[PDB]
């Protein structure tokens, strides 16, 4: 009921239009009972007395009724179709916008296929609470109210007997509906699991093929697929078990009113004809009662899926400080003060990390595999927040500077290069959309990117494949370097930017890069120490701690852990 109140809340901006829908469906309902009445009247007025001179008039009246009834049905559907899709659109909009506010930590831990499922498969399931579901409910409540008034108009005593069988129908609906929601919520969560497998396997098929895991991934899939078939059958059975069960309940009610009706006839209260009349009037009451009860069992599909939709909508999202400041006239005064960090929040990754960088300086961050170099950077980008310590950008705490301004001042070439499925121009234009075609062509020429871009079938307008896999690994990095330089940040981070870029090209760019790097503060993470030896400051890391700090020549003659790293290169 709690989820139902929330889901029904999406109908509030459509209140007036939904009132019209109710007004039109009530007119359609009174016309729906007027139509067989008029057919019954035509037989008794023109056919029985054999005076067919009146027939064209009664036919014209009946024809106008059918013309109005059909036009109202069209009108009901036309406005409801647009009304329902506006609600479904709002729910899809609300989910995507929410994910853009939700922290990065969520995307790494939760499968992407399950999130994709919740946006399409789960939102598509809240359609059986909208459209004709609203029309049938509206028509159901009017027919039920319109029948119950006609029952007491015939016989009050018998009407109490037909109303006393209603709690039994309500009870069996409550048992069935609870089970329907139980198995349907499970069906939608197993669906997300299966959607997660198909999604991950397609994006890594080459690796599955290379290690002949095609069969082992099939049996992995078959475990979840069989689980989906098992709970999906249970949900489908419970969904349509109520209509034949209610026909059994109606028959018990019919037998009870036949006994009660017969009793009243023997007491001189009513006649035999009244019993035959009341069974006709009870049929116009049981029909909407079973229809509304079956509709309650059907809306469990939307209710179970609504839970999965709302689950994403109530996630603790990334929020800025109420008194947060915007960084104006950025220079590059980066500083770390006794910073401690852990991802799992059990075993520490970074331990008392403390260092100061003056504006303009080109600082190098070297260390072994799993030292915590990317962690230092990920904290500066504020993707994660410090356990105990302070990060100061331009002399202001990172928690006090708004995320919008912080990420505008700081640029990053991530360890793992992520490209988009668009033109080479649009991929480079990302970060700084207000960059001229000449500025893009000049920036690509500087990082030796322009050569292979021109060789493509459409040049800069060549549409790239998913993540830009239609290029060499090194060529993808060159595009990532160009995109970051085009963004023109005051603070630039080059975390393993030339991992797959050859030493010949690496030497060629470095010379032209310095001119586009001067007057800007930069943090360069590299395992190719021979490139970062020219840096103003070298921060040597090991086991999440700063062991050595200073210039290349100073650290080499010190014969420390930096010397051991530099010598190991040959």
């Amino acid at each position: 009921t709690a989820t139902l109140r929330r889901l029904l809340g999406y109908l509030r901006p459509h209140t007036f239009t939904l009132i019209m829908v109710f007004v039109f469906v009530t007119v359609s309902s009174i016309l729906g009972v007027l139509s067989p009445y008029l057919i019954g009247k035509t037989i008794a007025v023109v056919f029985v007395p054999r005076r067919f001179d009146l027939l064209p008039r009664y036919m014209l009246i009946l024809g106008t009724i059918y013309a109005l009834t059909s036009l109202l049905f069209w009108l009901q559907g036309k406005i409801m179709l647009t009304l329902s899709q506006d609600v479904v659109f709002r729910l899809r909009k609300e989910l995507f916008e929410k994910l853009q506010r939700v922290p990065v930590g969520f995307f790494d831990r939760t499968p992407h296929g399950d999130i994709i499922s919740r946006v399409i498969n789960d939102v598509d399931n809240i359609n059986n609470v909208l459209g004709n579901s609203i029309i049938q409910f509206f028509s159901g409540i009017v027919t039920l109210a319109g029948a119950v008034i006609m029952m007491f108009r015939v016989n009050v005593i018998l009407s109490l007997v037909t109303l006393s069988i209603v709690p039994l129908t309500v009870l069996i609906t409550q048992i069935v509906s609870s089970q329907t929601r139980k198995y349907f919520y499970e069906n939608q969560r197993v669906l997300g699991q299966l959607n997660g497998i198909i999604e991950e396997d397609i994006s890594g098929l080459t690796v599955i093929k290379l290690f002949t895991r095609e069969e082992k991934e099939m049996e992995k899939f078959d475990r979840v697929n069989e689980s989906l078939r098992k709970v999906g059958t249970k949900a489908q059975i419970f969904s349509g078990v109520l209509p034949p069960l209610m026909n059994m309940v109606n028959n018990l009610g019919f037998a009870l009113i036949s006994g009660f009706g017969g009793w009243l006839a023997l007491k001189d209260i009513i006649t035999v004809g009244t019993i035959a009349t009341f069974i006709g009037y009870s049929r116009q009451f049981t029909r909407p009662l079973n229809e509304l009860s079956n509709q309650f069992n059907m809306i469990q599909m939307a209710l179970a899926s609504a839970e999965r939709i709302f689950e994403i909508l109530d996630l603790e999202e990334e929020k800025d400080d109420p008194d947060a400041v915007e960084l104006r006239e950025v220079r590059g005064e980066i500083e770390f003060k006794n910073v401690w960090f852990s991802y799992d929040k059990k075993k520490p990754v970074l331990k008392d990390i403390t260092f100061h960088i003056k504006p303009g300086q080109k600082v190098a961050l070297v260390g072994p595999t799993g030292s915590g170099k990317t962690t230092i950077v990920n904290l500066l980008m504020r993707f994660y927040d410090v356990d105990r310590g302070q990060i100061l950008v331009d002399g202001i705490d990172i928690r006090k500077i708004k995320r919008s301004s912080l990420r505008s001042s700081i640029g990053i070439v991530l360890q793992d290069t992520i490209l988009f499925s668009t033109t080479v121009k649009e991929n480079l234009k990302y970060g700084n959309p207000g960059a001229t075609d000449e500025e893009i062509k000049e920036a690509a020429k500087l990082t030796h990117s322009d050569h292979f871009i021109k060789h493509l079938p459409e040049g800069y307008e060549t549409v790239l494949t998913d993540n830009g896999e239609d290029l060499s690994q090194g060529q993808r990095q060159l595009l990532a370097i160009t995109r970051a330089f085009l963004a023109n940040p005051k603070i630039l981070i080059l975390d393993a930017a030339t991992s797959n870029v050859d030493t010949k090209t690496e030497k060629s760019i470095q010379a032209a890069m310095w001119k586009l790097m001067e007057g800007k503060t930069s943090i360069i993470i590299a395992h190719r120490l021979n490139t970062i030896k020219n840096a103003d400051l070298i921060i040597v890391l090991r086991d999440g701690e700063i062991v050595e700090m200073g210039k290349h020549d100073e650290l080499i003659q010190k014969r420390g852990f930096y010397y051991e790293l530099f010598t190991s290169q040959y």
Partner: nanobody, 124 residues
Framework: QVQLVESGGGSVQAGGSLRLSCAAS????????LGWFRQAPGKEREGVAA????????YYADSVKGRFTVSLDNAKNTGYLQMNSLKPEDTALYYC??????????????????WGQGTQVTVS
């Protein structure tokens, strides 16, 4: 203390006619139902004719239709059943039933019911 006396049952040849009387004596307030049923030497309870005093509608068996006719005398307090063009197929023990409604009966509690005696009607 209401008792029903049955009289008028004898041997009649095929295509003939015979009237049956059902006299009721006691503290009768208002009769609501009057019925007649035939019983074979190896059958439970059947249904031949019925009368409801509120409307006057008569409900007969499928074989009877336009043969037997049920009636009741108000002043005499006696039920009647006229049998016309009798076929040898309806050779059985005929009975009587009468439902009376007394002054001020409870909300859910019913009134009384009274059965006849039984008289043999043989048709060959």
């Amino acid at each position: 203390q209401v008792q029903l006396v049955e009289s008028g049952g004898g041997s009649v040849q095929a295509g003939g006619s015979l009237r049956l009387s059902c006299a009721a004596s006691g503290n009768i307030h208002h009769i609501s139902y009057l019925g007649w049923f035939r019983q074979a030497p190896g059958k439970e309870r059947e249904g031949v004719a019925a009368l409801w005093t509120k409307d006057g509608n008569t409900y007969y068996a499928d074989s009877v239709k336009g043969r037997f006719t049920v009636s009741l005398d108000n002043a005499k307090n006696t039920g009647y059943l006229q049998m016309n063009s009798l076929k040898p197929e309806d050779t059985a023990l005929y009975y009587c039933a009468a439902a009376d409604t007394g002054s001020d009966t409870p909300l859910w509690d019913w009134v009384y019911w009274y059965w006849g005696q039984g008289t043999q009607v043989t048709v060959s």
